[PDB]
């Protein structure tokens, strides 16, 4: 047995920020025996290890890298520890043509093939949580995300990859923050911004501050859901910390039901790897070589990965032996290219599962998704990302059975008048129209007898046919949504605008000229009467035509403030009221209302003047004055009230149509019943 040596240089962190080498150092050495005993692969070479402590500090890793690179046994690969040491070693190893194979460096900045040309690692990067988060966002339909963040650079690059990953899946970030040591003002801005999907990214000693500050500002609850990182200790809120005025029994309600995601190192199944070994017996064999307990030593969870790292190198030296390796110097670029092409395509089954690298040097692996459920975590799913396989396990216990949504939804309800107060007033209007047509036919039937032929024919008939249309103009005053739809609101609107104006103008013009002419003949001929009536009606349809030309009417929605349903617990409901309007609706009927009020107040004074000093026995009226009295006292009291109470739902329609049915009943009762009480009752 010749058994020549091939050397491997390594830096194991024994202390510092991440003391992994307390457990990764035996797990490599044990693994080395499993390559030096099995005679199938590397049949003549023997791998030996030269290691140094590095303390996760580049100020000593530089000296130890000098000691590795400038001594007698020529190394063939380098194996650094923490992220910073691996950054220095991987950027420095280009000038010596060395492969760098890390086992614990999780920065996203080490996936830059331009800077680091010969890098490989088996610990996956921290941009492996982001496809898991994107899959957990598409599954529950969320579409708005707030991200709080401690401003260390690894979290900055994690979120700057999360944005680029999430903008191609139709989701958009709405809110970003940052802090250094005091998280008070970003959770204040999160409270006042009112976002409900939070992706927190910070270490443990900041999490214990920010979560009881969340409890103090009451940001948790039924409608909130967080997202954290998973490699915290499993009782990270139940420990004592004097740096907060928060209680241990408190904040356990505040971290309630938050999803965490983490990388899974150890294989959850119980199959056989390429070393003919399972997970539980690997842990059992490793626990012998440690001088302490697994809960107290550092870097116990990462200890499988280093194992597979060694095995990966062994396979990369079996697919090339066929240039020998006892001649590798630091200047020839060839053998490193052979090893690089051999390790670019690697796919096998180790203790951590299926090991296969990416095109940027990282390692693609599974992800575990768990949730807090009453003080302790519970595994609620697994996710593979290289072929998109989710595995759910039906344990996501929410509060209301369903996961909450991101923002509250608006409901644009409508508000319609109750149909009973529409239908009663419409049937009173039909009784009015049949009374009007029967009185018109009665007055037109006796067109020869010299009791109404001599007094005033062709004028009370015109009053009655005006009041006919004025009574018929209350059907299109109550058709908004319950009985009509849309896209014919101009038809109903122009109908109600022409009909009511034409009816009122015609009727009051006739009853006004019947007082005006007896006043102007008492104080010292039907063509002038018809001229006055046609002139008033023509001026009124002229100004209605000017309304038709300049600013036509259309539908317009106004809205009130939002309310609460109190059958659900979170819906926002806003009411909508639509009506006919224009751009200048207050003035363009204000002119008409003022003009008609002036005409009405002119008429009532002459009706009082020619009361009983008529002595004009060719007209025989005596009660048209009362017919102007009641219309003048009834229209002037409901003309400003139905423009004041336009915000009310149905009182405007009630007052308007009530005024219209009273002012058209009484002007036909008091005008026509003495015309029949003296003729076909005194017959």
């Amino acid at each position: 047995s010749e058994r020549r040596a091939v050397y491997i240089g390594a830096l194991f962190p024994m202390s510092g920020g991440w003391p992994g080498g307390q457990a990764c150092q035996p797990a490599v050495e044990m693994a080395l025996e499993d390559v030096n005993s099995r005679r199938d692969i590397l049949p003549d070479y023997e791998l030996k290890l030269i290691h140094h402590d590095s303390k996760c500090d580049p100020g000593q890793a530089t000296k130890y890298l000098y000691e590795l690179l400038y001594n007698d046994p020529i190394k063939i690969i380098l194996m650094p520890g923490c992220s910073s040491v691996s950054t220095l070693v991987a950027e420095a190893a280009r000038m010596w043509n060395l492969i760098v194979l890390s086992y614990g460096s999780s920065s996203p900045a080490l996936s830059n093939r331009q800077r680091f040309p010969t890098f490989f690692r088996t610990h996956p990067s921290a941009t492996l949580h982001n496809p898991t988060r994107v899959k957990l966002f598409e599954k529950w339909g969320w579409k708005k995300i707030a991200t709080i963040q401690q401003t260390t650079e690894v979290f900055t690059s994690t979120l700057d990859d999360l944005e680029e990953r999430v903008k191609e899946a139709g989701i958009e970030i709405t809110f970003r923050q940052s802090f250094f040591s005091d998280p008070a003002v970003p959770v204040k801005n999160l409270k006042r911004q009112d976002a409900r999907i939070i992706v927190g990214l910070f270490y443990e000693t900041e999490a214990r501050k920010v979560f009881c500050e969340v409890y103090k500002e009451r940001l948790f609850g039924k409608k909130y859901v967080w997202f954290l990182i998973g490699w915290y200790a499993d009782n990270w809120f139940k420990i004592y910390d004097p740096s907060i005025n928060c209680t241990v029994d408190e904040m356990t309600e505040a971290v309630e039901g938050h999803i965490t995601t983490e990388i899974v190192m150890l294989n959850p199944a119980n199959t056989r790897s390429i070393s003919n070994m399972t997970s539980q017996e690997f842990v059992e064999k490793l626990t012998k070589r440690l001088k302490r307990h697994p809960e107290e030593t550092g870097g116990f969870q990462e200890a499988p990965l280093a194992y597979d790292a060694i095995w990966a190198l062994a396979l990369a030296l079996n697919k090339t032996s066929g240039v020998r390796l006892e001649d590798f110097n630091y200047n020839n670029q060839t053998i490193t290219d052979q090893i690089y092409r051999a390790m670019n395509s690697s796919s096998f089954e180790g203790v951590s599962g299926h090991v296969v690298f990416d095109a940027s040097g990282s390692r693609m692996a599974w992800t575990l998704i768990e949730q807090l459920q009453g003080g302790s975590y519970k595994k609620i799913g697994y996710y593979d990302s290289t072929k998109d396989d989710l595995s759910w396990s039906k344990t996501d216990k929410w509060i209301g059975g369903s996961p909450p949504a991101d923002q509250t939804l608006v409901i644009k309800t409508f508000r319609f008048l109750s149909q009973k107060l529409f239908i009663s007033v419409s049937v009173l209007s039909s009784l009015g129209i049949v009374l009007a047509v029967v009185c018109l036919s009665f007055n037109i039937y006796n067109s020869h007898v010299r009791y109404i032929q001599n007094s005033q024919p062709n004028l009370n008939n015109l009053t009655a046919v005006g009041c006919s249309l004025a009574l018929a103009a209350v059907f299109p005053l109550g058709l908004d949504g319950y009985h009509i739809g849309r896209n014919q609101f101009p038809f109903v609107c122009q109908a109600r605008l022409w009909l009511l104006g034409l009816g009122f103008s015609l009727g009051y013009g006739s009853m006004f000229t019947k007082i005006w002419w007896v006043h102007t003949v008492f104080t010292k001929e039907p063509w002038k009467l018809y001229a006055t009536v046609g002139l008033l009606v023509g001026m009124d349809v002229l100004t209605l035509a000017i309304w038709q030309i300049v600013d036509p009417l259309h539908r317009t929605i106004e809205t009130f403030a939002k309310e609460e349903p109190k059958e659900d617990i979170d819906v926002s409901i806003l009411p909508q009221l639509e009506h006919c309007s224009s751009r200048k609706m207050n003035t363009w009927l204000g002119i008409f209302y003022g003009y008609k009020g002036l005409l009405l107040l002119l008429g009532i004074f002459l009706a009082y003047e020619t009361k009983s000093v008529s002595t004009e026995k060719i007209n025989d009226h005596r009660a048209v004055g009362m017919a102007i009295y009641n219309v003048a006292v009834l229209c002037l009291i409901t003309a400003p009230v139905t423009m004041i109470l336009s915000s009310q739902q149905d009182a405007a329609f009630a007052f308007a149509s009530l005024a219209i049915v009273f002012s058209s009943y009484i002007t036909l009762v008091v005008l026509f019943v003495p015309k029949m009480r003296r003729l076909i009752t005194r017959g």
């Binding site: 580049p58 100020g59 000593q60 530089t62 000296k63 000098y66 690179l69 400038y70 220095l88 950027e91 420095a92 280009r94 000038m95 010596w96 104080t523 002036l598 107040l601 002119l602 004074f605 003047e609 000093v613």
Partner: protein, 675 residues
Amino acid sequence: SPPLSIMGLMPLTKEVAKGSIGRGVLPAVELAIEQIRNESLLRPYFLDLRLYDTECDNAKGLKAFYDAIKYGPNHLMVFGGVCPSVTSIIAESLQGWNLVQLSFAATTPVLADKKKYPYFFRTVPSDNAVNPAILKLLKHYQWKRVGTLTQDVQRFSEVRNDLTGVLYGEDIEISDTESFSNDPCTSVKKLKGNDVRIILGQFDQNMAAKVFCCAYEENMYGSKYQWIIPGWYEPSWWEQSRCLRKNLLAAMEGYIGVDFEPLSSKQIKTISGKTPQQYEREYNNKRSGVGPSKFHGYAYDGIWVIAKTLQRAMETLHASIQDFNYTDHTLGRIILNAMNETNFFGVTGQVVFRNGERMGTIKFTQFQDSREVKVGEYNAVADTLEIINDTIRFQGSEPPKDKTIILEQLRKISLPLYSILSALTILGMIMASAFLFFNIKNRNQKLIKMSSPYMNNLIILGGMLSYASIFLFGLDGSFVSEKTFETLCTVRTWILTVGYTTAFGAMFAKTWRVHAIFKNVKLLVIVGGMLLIDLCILICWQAVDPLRRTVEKYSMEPDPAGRDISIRPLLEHCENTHMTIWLGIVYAYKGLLMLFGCFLAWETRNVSIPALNDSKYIGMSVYNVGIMCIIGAAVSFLTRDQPNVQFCIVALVIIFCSTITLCLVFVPKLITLRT
């Protein structure tokens, strides 16, 4: 003669950019060592510098540093290092070999920390050394409001984060904070929204042209604004695009560039025995092959610091060097304390270290129309600023203040116009008193007895009270006080409606009795009831919601003076509670009474001979008094903002309305009673 080896790391190739630095100081260091061998500074030994090329790259620099440790002789301290990353990599790791480093071009602030890099010293001031300079500029000009505009690179974010911590504890606020990456001028539009005129820019050479052309499109220059930017740009950097050159030269005038000073000016003998001017002429005669670089005096002082430190360490050691391996560390502590105790005078000023930083000098320069020129200096040792008087200028006359000054400038009315209208209404008052005297002199007469002269006394008293109101109208602003104004307007609306009501009630009662006598085919209670109604509405006005003073303000629009302050024109009004209730009711009641009286006067249109001789011109006067009162109230609603005008037109309307109706009643009296 045993040598003393010093490792030197500098970019010495032509293929990199910053290598133009590395050749440019190579004469000056060559100028220094020849002096130290001439005087025999290191009598026991002699100095020897060994150069190495790092090529401004992490891998190449680390390989060259490793090769210099392996193959070269026993070095004692490291000198040089230019690029920031390579100096970071080496300076973190010196402590393992017990070497002390001295730089001359590492200007990054990251090396200020003494937990990471404890064996590091540099002689160039850092990039934070401009931050206690700009502060001591502001206290020289008493500016206190500033607004920062930062680029989003680490190299400038460190400077801004230090400026925030150094402005604390002083009377200077940071009213606005900005940032930009590629889009400069939406940020400067947001800065214009807060209207700040002192900007502390921090950005590289590319974005400066974009910021200044986007300021030219925003017109952020002149004698209002001030720019304070870094000054390590290339000379004539504006020449290299889309923007117009002369517009840029007119927008870029008057900024202040802050930098570190290349060479001192206080012409004293230095420790070598020369002047700064003699050294400058010597190095200029030496540098004949290549262009200059602004770091050479710092290299000269670095070599002298190294020599004095080795001398002090040798004198300390001989009271207990050629045997120095890197395994020793007591010699490292000795050399560290010897370099910590450095205090002397060199060609860049008083060379002295505080916590590992050079306490050096800062130079302010200002841009004048073709070039930048030195306009001051700031010695940071004694903490004093020296401004050369006759070089710094601005566009205007004063140093421009931060925020403009607001001024009230109430809108008053013209004393000639007010005096003219008071003269017109006082002659109208004389005319009304003359008519009352005539009608009270000619009382017993068979034309006056049949014309109801007591109603004419009422209409003269109404015209008198209507005339008297214009004096109380418009005593506004700069005329009386701030307490009479809450009573003057309520006594004015007390008197004016009574003066209207008496006269119009007299005319309306005359026309009403004409109509009542005509229809059938004593007085003085009508005006009594109308006065009762209006006194009731006036005491209901006064008792519940009285009129008080209320000011309206505009939006500080014009600048007409030229003294560069803003004025905020403001008006006074007597209106406080609802003003669409207790004016609409009064106006509607008066309008309805007017229109009823006008229609009653038209209904007769002069058919009555016997009882009242003048019903014709009385109805003519009603007609009169209606329409012009309507147009007066309408024009008062129209121009409710401008002052000289609406007062003048209300005064003209009221003097016409009160002088025509006093003519039409009493002018036939004179013609018939003189004839």
